[PDB]
Amino acid sequence: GIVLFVDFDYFYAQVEEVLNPSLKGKPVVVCVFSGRFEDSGAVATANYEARKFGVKAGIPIVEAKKILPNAVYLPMRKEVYQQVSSRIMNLLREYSEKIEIASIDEAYLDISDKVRDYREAYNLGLEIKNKILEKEKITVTVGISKNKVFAKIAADMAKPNGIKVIDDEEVKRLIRELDIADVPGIGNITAEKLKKLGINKLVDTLSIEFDKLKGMIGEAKAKYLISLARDEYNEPIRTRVRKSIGRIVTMKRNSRNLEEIKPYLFRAIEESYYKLDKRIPKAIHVVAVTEDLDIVSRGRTFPHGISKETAYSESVKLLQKILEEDERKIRRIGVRFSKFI
DNA sequence: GTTGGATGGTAGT
DNA sequence: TAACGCTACCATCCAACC
Ligand SMILES: Nc1nc2c(ncn2[C@H]2C[C@H](O)[C@@H](COP(=O)(O)OP(=O)(O)OP(=O)(O)O)O2)c(=O)[nH]1
Ligand SMILES: [Ca+2]
Ligand SMILES: [Ca+2]
Ligand SMILES: [Ca+2]
Numbered sequence: 032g033i034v035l036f037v038d039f040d041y042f043y044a045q046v047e048e049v050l051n052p053s054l055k056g057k058p059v060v061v062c063v064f065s066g067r068f069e070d071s072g073a074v075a076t077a078n079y080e081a082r083k084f085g086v087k088a089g090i091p092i093v094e095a096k097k098i099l100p101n102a103v104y105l106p107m108r109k110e111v112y113q114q115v116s117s118r119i120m121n122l123l124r125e126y127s128e129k130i131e132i133a134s135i136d137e138a139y140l141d142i143s144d145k146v147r148d149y150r151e152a153y154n155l156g157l158e159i160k161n162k163i164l165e166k167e168k169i170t171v172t173v174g175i176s177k178n179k180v181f182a183k184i185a186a187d188m189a190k191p192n193g194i195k196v197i198d199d200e201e202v203k204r205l206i207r208e209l210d211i212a213d214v215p216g217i218g219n220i221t222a223e224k225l226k227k228l229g230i231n232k233l234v235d236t237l238s239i240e241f242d243k244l245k246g247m248i249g250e251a252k253a254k255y256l257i258s259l260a261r262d263e264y265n266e267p268i269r270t271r272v273r274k275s276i277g278r279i280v281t282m283k284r285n286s287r288n289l290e291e292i293k294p295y296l297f298r299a300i301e302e303s304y305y306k307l308d309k310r311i312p313k314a315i316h317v318v319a320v321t322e323d324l325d326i327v328s329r330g331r332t333f334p335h336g337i338s339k340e341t342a343y344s345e346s347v348k349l350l351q352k353i354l355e356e357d358e359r360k361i362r363r364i365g366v367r368f369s370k371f372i
Numbered sequence: 373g374t375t376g377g378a379t380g381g382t383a384g385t
Numbered sequence: 386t387a388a389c390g391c392t393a394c395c396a397t398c399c400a401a402c403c
Contacts, residue, residue, distance in 0.1 A: 216382090330377085
């Protein structure tokens with residue numbers, strides 16, 4: 032089994048540099064302006080020049096501008112980046128039809144039937160990197176290993192503009208030596224719980240009682256880590272099937288007034304239903320981000336598909352329930368559809 | 373006993 | 386000082402169903 036994982040470098044910012052090459056070589060910050068006041072919002076991503084100074088995905092735009100007042104600030108044009116992404120995913124499908132698109136900028140290819148060893152895989156990785164450069168002028172990072180998890184780890188190690196193979200001997204080394212916090216799916220909360228248990232490396236999961244591990248981090252995470260530690264993780268590459276589709280928007284000002292919130296909620300439903308593209312959902316959830324940035328939701332699953340008209344009717348009832356059951360003001364409001372027929 | 377929807381936690385991007 | 390946006394998968398609680 033040979034898996035090749037590709038992740039596009041500083042993606043949104045890189046696309047903007049392709050579209051305007053005078054930007055290349057200096058700080059570029061792509062921003063999600065929320066409209067609440069001038070420069071309210073968050074950074075979607077920045078190029079590596081901006082990252083040197085701490086400007087990166089998730090920080091407030093006002094904070095970025097405090098640090099780098101003279102950087103180029105651009106509004107997120109997600110439809111444009113999606114056009115580029117879709118073209119690159121099509122390029123990748125020419126190298127293998129067994130492709131799992133995992134995000135707007137990354138995919139796993141099962142290349143087992145396309146190459147015979149890691150030497151051939153590495154050369155295919157370079158061909159892929161060259162193809163994407165020729166066609167789209169986008170640099171990417173490639174990770175290659177025996178499964179999805181280690182191909183991802185390989186790319187994480189090699190970025191930006193990298194290519195890295197983690198062969199069988201290195202997999203066994205990493206099971207002993209890799210900080211378990213750097214394993215995909217282990218965030219800060221799980222990492223701290225593992226630490227308390229004295230689990231610092233994957234190999235350490237083999238000498239703790241499963242019941243103790245399970246009790247602390249849950250059954251699914253425990254089984255996942257053990258499978259990796261035994262070098263028996265074998266999750267197949269599978270075609271991505273979207274399970275939910277939604278939109279959430281930021282309100283100009285916080286509110287508990289139904290008629291004030293409704294316009295935003297309806298905008299979210301319209302954009303959401305458009306996104307559905309022939310999909311027919313049986314479940315709807317109204318999602319509210321409260322004034323203190325907590326996320327609350329109310330939902331309903333129907334025995335049949337939900338028409339746009341039913342989505343309008345039901346969403347108001349769900350927003351009403353949130354208001355009735357939660358005293359706090361609402362800051363962001365939206366909808367998510369799921370359980371597609 | 374057992375499912376599985378409602379709601380939220382965790383992760384990552 | 387400010388905190389967008391989107392999606393996946395898992396856990397818990399509890400009403401409905403064996
Ligand atoms: N709105 C928004 N978009 C994000 C956020 N994080 C990532 N994205 C978008 C913009 C990124 O360019 C794109 C791909 O995510 P990545 O995690 O792979 O980061 P990126 O490619 O920008 O940097 P890279 O060199 O991988 O580190 O997805 C975020 O917090 N908010
Ligand atoms: Ca990336
Ligand atoms: Ca990525
Ligand atoms: Ca981590």
